[PDB]
Write a protein that binds this ligand. Structure first.
Ligand code: NAG
Ligand code: AXV
Length: 342
């Protein structure tokens, strides 16, 4: 079990002004640290954040959080559930800022809600240094869905934070799961949502990407294939070719020719954006998230499981014979890979 710690800096808050926090299970014999960013969509104006506060309040507030969580998947401590990093120090950071982890704006007389995702990550890192993180060899910043996009937005800032504090020896790396979206045509008539959100949240993006797209165009940096080439930290990208969230925002729900072509073109476009991503795992399945799911060990691409691919990645950061790191399916239709989640 992982134990809850509310942030000592109570100015770093969830949407409703309650303190943010993190769940921690230490492994005293390990210098590996895993910091996981939870996902769960977002909200981008007053009325839709009000709706979210009514029936999704744990994503907006710490008032009802439990004192413990069970670590699952890559956060599990048993070797049988987690062949990759079972002995690591484990941290689960709950998503209570509704801003895809980009915000830096407090609740005030002008703002009903606080959007502090980027500041929550920085404060969790600061407080953990006094609990063992100062001795780390690797800090892996991981996340699913909105948390996967959050990895892309924040991994270089964590690296810069530790360098400025005097820790040049901690290697910061990223693992982005189900956070690699496309700004494509809908099937029946995201960019506008993100454009709205950035202004409402006072959202922040990585510096080099911001310098390319410039003012008013920062929304471009929420799309993996645009922001990834600007990053300096090593990032492993896990992405279903037919992600259910992508199909949802594309307004896709006996498949006729028009829809068949749309789905096939979406898979081919996703595969194209990953061609030059050297650490990636992209199966041809219709699904959503993987890395903290209990059965994340079951799926395979070209005969290699995801825990194995991540182990091969670790070795490459010390090509490897029989231990690949770039794994992208080529078959063109959902569940053409027999190991897809049922
Ligand atoms: C608390 O967090 C805020 C916002 O990130 C920061 O400006 C401030 O310096 C922090 N205070 C302390 C005592 O760490
Ligand atoms: N939910 C969730 N995560 C998410 N949705 C996106 C839409 C566009 C660009 C990046 C995105 N990340």
């Amino acid at each position: 079990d992982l134990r809850l710690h509310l942030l000592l800096n109570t100015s770093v808050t969830c949407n409703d002004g309650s303190p943010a926090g993190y769940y921690l299970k230490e492994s005293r014999g390990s210098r590996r640290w895993l910091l996981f960013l939870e996902g769960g969509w977002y909200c981008f104006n007053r009325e839709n954040c009000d709706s979210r506060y009514d029936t999704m309040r744990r994503l907006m507030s710490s008032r009802d959080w439990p004192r413990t969580r069970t670590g699952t998947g890559i956060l599990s401590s048993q070797p049988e559930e987690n062949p990759y990093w079972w002995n690591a120090n484990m941290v689960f950071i709950p998503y209570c800022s509704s801003d895809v982890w980009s915000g830096a704006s407090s609740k005030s007389e002008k703002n009903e809600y606080a959007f502090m995702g980027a500041l929550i990550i920085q404060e969790v890192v600061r407080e953990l240094l006094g609990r063992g993180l100062s001795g780390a060899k690797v800090l892996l910043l991981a996340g699913s869905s909105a948390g996967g996009t959050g990895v892309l937005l924040n991994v270089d800032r964590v690296a810069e934070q530790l360098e400025k504090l005097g820790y040049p020896a901690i290697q910061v790396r990223g693992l982005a799961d189900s956070g690699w979206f496309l700004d494509n045509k809908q099937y029946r008539h995201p960019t506008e949502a993100i454009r709205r959100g950035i202004r409402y949240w006072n959202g922040v993006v990585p510096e080099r990407c911001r310098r390319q797209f410039q003012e008013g165009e920062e929304w471009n940096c929420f799309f993996g294939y645009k922001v990834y080439p600007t990053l300096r930290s090593p990032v492993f990208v896990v992405q279903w070719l037919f992600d259910e969230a992508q199909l949802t925002v594309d307004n896709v729900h006996p498949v006729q020719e028009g829809l068949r072509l749309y789905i096939q073109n979406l898979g081919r476009e996703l595969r194209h954006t990953l061609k030059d991503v050297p650490a990636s795992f992209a199966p041809a399945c219709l699904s959503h998230e993987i890395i903290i799911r209990s059965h994340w060990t079951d799926v395979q691409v070209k005969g290699t499981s995801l825990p194995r691919a991540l182990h091969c990645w670790d070795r490459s950061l010390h090509p490897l014979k029989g231990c690949p790191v770039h794994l992208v399916d080529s078959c063109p239709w959902p569940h053409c890979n027999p190991s897809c989640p049922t």
